[PDB]
Amino acid sequence: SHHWGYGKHNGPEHWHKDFPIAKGERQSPVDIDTHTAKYDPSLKPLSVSYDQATSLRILNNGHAFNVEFDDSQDKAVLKGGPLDGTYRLIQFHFHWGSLDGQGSEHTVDKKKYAAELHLVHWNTKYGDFGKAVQQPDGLAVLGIFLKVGSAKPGLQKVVDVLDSIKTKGKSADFTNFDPRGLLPESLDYWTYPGSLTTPPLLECVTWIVLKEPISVSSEQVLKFRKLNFNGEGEPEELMVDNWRPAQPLKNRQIKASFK
Ligand SMILES: CCCC(CCC)C(=O)N[C@@H]1Cc2ccc(S(N)(=O)=O)cc2C1
Ligand SMILES: [Zn+2]
């Protein structure tokens, strides 16, 4: 009944009770101190190959909405950078705020963006997602910040279908969506070992956070804010501020792909 969420009695500060790893040694998100981050020459060129990506459905899971992809074959993959091997795209989703001044999970020199896009990939050496989340290098999440300004044309198809998945549990066919339309020009990034930012908070993620944010219009993000945390027929609880705040960096160093 009393499941985790982002409210006063079931939010981020409560998660550790059911998920003790919430106070772990490599939790995410974290604040990215740009001056302390160090350029790493050992990093190989990052490769984002989404040309063959095949989306299948979009779902409101009561915490955010997921655009799911068919990962039964080697198509949309992420490799290079800090990664060893190939990681396959399985889904992407966002975290956003109730206001333009907040919403992102990672922060840059304490600056919060309006939202943050997470493209989730699993290490193919482990067979599938389930086995991957039992490994310290099982996942790679490409994070992209969203700022409010000009509209992002490639995001509109997502925005327009949200009306069909307003409440928790609802899903809708969502084929032929090209995630390449959500990527900024530059692939400059920061990377560090972390975790899932929502329960179960598993520490199996290599985070790759792009420095360049994408711009989305006020109208686009306002539609994100029309979604509901609640299910159909229940009192309306707007899906906003579904972000976890920065966690202790502890024994970690953030590396930059650029000088
Ligand atoms: C450990 C796997 C359990 C299942 C449960 C949902 C049916 C699951 O898919 N959880 C999802 C998987 C996933 C992937 C990335 C992130 S994030 N925010 O760090 O980018 C959060 C979560 C929670
Ligand atoms: Zn996320």
Domains of the chain: 1-259 (3.10.200.10)
Active site residue 9: no
Cα–Cα distances (Å) from 81 to 43, 139, 188, in that order, read 5, 14, 10
Q: Which ligand is nearest to the CA of 96?
A: 2
Cα–Cα distances (Å) from 159 to 54, 67, 92, 165, in that order, read 18, 12, 14, 11
Task: Indicate if ligand 1 lies below 6 Å from the C-beta of 141.
Answer: yes
DSSP summary character for residue 231: B
Task: Indicate if ligand 1 lies below 6 Å from the C-beta of 246.
Answer: no
DSSP summary character for residue 98: S
Q: Which two tokens stand for residue 43?
A: 């990093």
DSSP calls for 156-224: HHHHHHGGGG-SBT-EEE--S--GGGG--S---EEEEEE--SSTT--S-EEEEEESSPEEE-HHHHHHH
Handedness of CA 202, 97, 53, 71 (dihedral sign): positive
Residues 6+ positions from 13 with CB-CB distance below 8 Å: none
Neighbours of 154 (CB within 10 A): 16
93 annotated among ligand-binding-site residues: yes
Residues 15 and 22: their CA atoms lie apart, in Å, by 7
**Nearest C-alpha to atom 13 of ligand 1 is from which residue?**
196
Secondary structure of residue 256 in the 3-state scheme: strand
Residues 25 and 106: their CA atoms lie apart, in Å, by 17
Q: Which two tokens stand for residue 85?
A: 């091997």
Q: Which two tokens stand for residue 230?
A: 């609640």
Task: Indicate if ligand 1 lies below 6 Å from the C-beta of 121.
Answer: no
Handedness of CA 245, 248, 252, 258 (dihedral sign): positive
> Residues 132, 204: contact at Cβ < 8 Å?
yes
* Structure obtained using: X-ray
| CA 135 to ligand 1 centroid distance, Å | 14
Strand partners, 216: 148
From 65, 196, 242, give the residue whose CB has the most ligand 1 atoms within 8 Å, as the site to mutate.
196
Residues 2 and 144: their CA atoms lie apart, in Å, by 31
Task: Indicate if ligand 1 lies below 6 Å from the C-beta of 197.
Answer: yes
35 annotated among ligand-binding-site residues: no
Task: Indicate if ligand 1 lies below 6 Å from the C-beta of 118.
Answer: yes
Handedness of CA 130, 206, 93, 242 (dihedral sign): positive
2 annotated among ligand-binding-site residues: no
